[PDB]
Amino acid sequence: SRLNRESVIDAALELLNETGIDGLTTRKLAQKLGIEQPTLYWHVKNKRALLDALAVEILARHHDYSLPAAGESWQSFLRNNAMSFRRALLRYRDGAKVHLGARPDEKQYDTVETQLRFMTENGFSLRDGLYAISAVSHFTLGAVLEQQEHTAALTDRPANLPPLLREALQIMDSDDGEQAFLHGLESLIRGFEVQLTALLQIV
Amino acid sequence: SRLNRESVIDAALELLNETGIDGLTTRKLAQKLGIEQPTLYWHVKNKRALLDALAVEILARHHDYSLPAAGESWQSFLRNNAMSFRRALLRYRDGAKVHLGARPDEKQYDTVETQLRFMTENGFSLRDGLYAISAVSHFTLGAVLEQQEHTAALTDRPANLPPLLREALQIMDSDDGEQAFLHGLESLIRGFEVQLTALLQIV
Ligand SMILES: Cc1c2c(c(O)c3c(O)cccc13)C(=O)[C@]1(O)C(=O)C(C(N)=O)=C(O)[C@@H](N(C)C)[C@@H]1C2
Ligand SMILES: Cc1c2c(c(O)c3c(O)cccc13)C(=O)[C@]1(O)C(=O)C(C(N)=O)=C(O)[C@@H](N(C)C)[C@@H]1C2
Ligand SMILES: [Cl-]
Ligand SMILES: [Cl-]
Ligand SMILES: [Cl-]
Ligand SMILES: [Cl-]
Ligand SMILES: [Cl-]
Ligand SMILES: [Cl-]
Ligand SMILES: [Cl-]
Ligand SMILES: [Cl-]
Ligand SMILES: [Mg+2]
Ligand SMILES: [Mg+2]
Numbered sequence: 001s002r003l004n005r006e007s008v009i010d011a012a013l014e015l016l017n018e019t020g021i022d023g024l025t026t027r028k029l030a031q032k033l034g035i036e037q038p039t040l041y042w043h044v045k046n047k048r049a050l051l052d053a054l055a056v057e058i059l060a061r062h063h064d065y066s067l068p069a070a071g072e073s074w075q076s077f078l079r080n081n082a083m084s085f086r087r088a089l090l091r092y093r094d095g096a097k098v099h100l101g102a103r104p105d106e107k108q109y110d111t112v113e114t115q116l117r118f119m120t121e122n123g124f125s126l127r128d129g130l131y132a133i134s135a136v137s138h139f140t141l142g143a144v145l146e147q148q149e150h151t152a153a154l155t156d157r158p159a160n161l162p163p164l165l166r167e168a169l170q171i172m173d174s175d176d177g178e179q180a181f182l183h184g185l186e187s188l189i190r191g192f193e194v195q196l197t198a199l200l201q202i203v
Numbered sequence: 204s205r206l207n208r209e210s211v212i213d214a215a216l217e218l219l220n221e222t223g224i225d226g227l228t229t230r231k232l233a234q235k236l237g238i239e240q241p242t243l244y245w246h247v248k249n250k251r252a253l254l255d256a257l258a259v260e261i262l263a264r265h266h267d268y269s270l271p272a273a274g275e276s277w278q279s280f281l282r283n284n285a286m287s288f289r290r291a292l293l294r295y296r297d298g299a300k301v302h303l304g305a306r307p308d309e310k311q312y313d314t315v316e317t318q319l320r321f322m323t324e325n326g327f328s329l330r331d332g333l334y335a336i337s338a339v340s341h342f343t344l345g346a347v348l349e350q351q352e353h354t355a356a357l358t359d360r361p362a363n364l365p366p367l368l369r370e371a372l373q374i375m376d377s378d379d380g381e382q383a384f385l386h387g388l389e390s391l392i393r394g395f396e397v398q399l400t401a402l403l404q405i406v
Pocket of ligand 12: 302305306307340
């Protein structure tokens with residue numbers, strides 16, 4: 001079929017959902033596209049190049065809150081940005097693992113620069129704004145990775161529990177992690193605000 | 204050589220540092236131990252069983268702050284627990300990925316139950332204490348995963364930056380992520396405290 005970049009991404013994403021990240025291979029991608037492996041090689045040099053591209057295109061296509069709305073507070077931005085990033089990560093099987101393979105790509109530079117500048121325009125130093133943005137990113141990624149690895153590990157093998165842990169798993173599995181994620185997100189934001197408003201005061 | 208459980212773990216950990224998680228195989232483990240693959244199979248049924256065991260033994264051996272000190276505050280416990288968990292995760296190549304393969308194992312039940320009970324004894328509901336413990340876990344795991352994947356991806360391929368991002372990478376690479384981790388950790392803890400002390404007040 002067609003092997004323009006967009007079409008190759010479409011197929012690779014379709015394949016990722018079928019196989020997961022570990023099981024995705026350029027050989028399987030060539031099969032899905034109806035082509036020979038050396039043909040695919042002209043377009044996609046190896047799995048790593050493919051994964052790097054997926055990490056970018058997943059956010060380009062499905063992360064709709066990269067940028068603040070006009071007039072938006074930094075708090076509200078971090079909240080909306082996190083919710084969007086989580087959704088985009090969860091959209092594809094092993095999505096968090098796909099993301100983590102790389103740091104910002106050149107096509108992402110303008111976006112992430114704008115985010116860093118936005119925090120500095122709202123009273124943060126570059127360093128403290130980077131600390132906040134990174135903390136949100138890492139908390140979000142960790143939460144998704146946990147969900148997605150539990151989905152995986154369930155396919156290899158199943159799972160005398162003590163009472164609070166029993167209850168905690170029952171609670172942690174009453175939704176897809178969303179309550180825990182949102183509650184932690186608010187805690188994080190509030191801690192950043194306390195820190196910011198403190199200025200040079202001992203806090 | 205010897206194939207008691209302890210000795211197999213020792214060798215597998217040694218191998219993990221040599222290969223990383225994706226490149227670790229039971230075939231390579233059998234080679235390191237000087238044995239045939241069917242011999243190893245009697246002891247270790249597959250890679251997943253091996254990884255599950257490593258996730259547990261890495262913490263048993265190297266996470267020394269599972270439990271609070273007598274009289275310790277919940278804040279100080281979460282801090283010390285996080286620092287220890289991070290160190291243990293960072294100790295082995297792809298350690299965060301090793302951890303994420305599983306939820307608490309039976310040999311961990313008493314430990315994690317004690318942690319959940321400890322939060323409830325310090326004013327949290329089980330749910331809100333679980334929210335805090337999970338948030339710390341996920342933030343810590345996300346931060347480590349980012350560091351460890353950057354170490355990996357560097358071996359496949361290297362890396363016009365805009366100025367804040369340039370500076371952010373220079374800042375994010377001035378240590379091994381420790382400043383960013385510790386600053387986020389304090390933000391998280393403080394947000395949990397604000398929430399706890401609020402009780403039923405609009406906050
Ligand atoms: C600023 C920054 C970001 C990211 C990142 O990986 C990163 C880094 O690895 C080093 C230095 C800075 C950054 C994000 O991945 C990203 O997810 C992202 O690419 C991004 C985006 N593309 O819109 C975001 O929304 C951000 N958000 C989750 C806080 C965050 C921004
Ligand atoms: C309570 C709990 C924990 C963990 C966990 O995975 C988990 C879960 O998957 C479902 C429900 C509850 C928990 C931890 O991994 C763990 O890392 C852990 O095993 C653990 C430990 N073994 O000492 C911890 O130190 C904890 N800390 C990082 C907050 C955390 C505790
Ligand atoms: Cl074509
Ligand atoms: Cl195209
Ligand atoms: Cl491949
Ligand atoms: Cl707002
Ligand atoms: Cl033996
Ligand atoms: Cl033993
Ligand atoms: Cl294997
Ligand atoms: Cl204390
Ligand atoms: Mg990133
Ligand atoms: Mg865990």
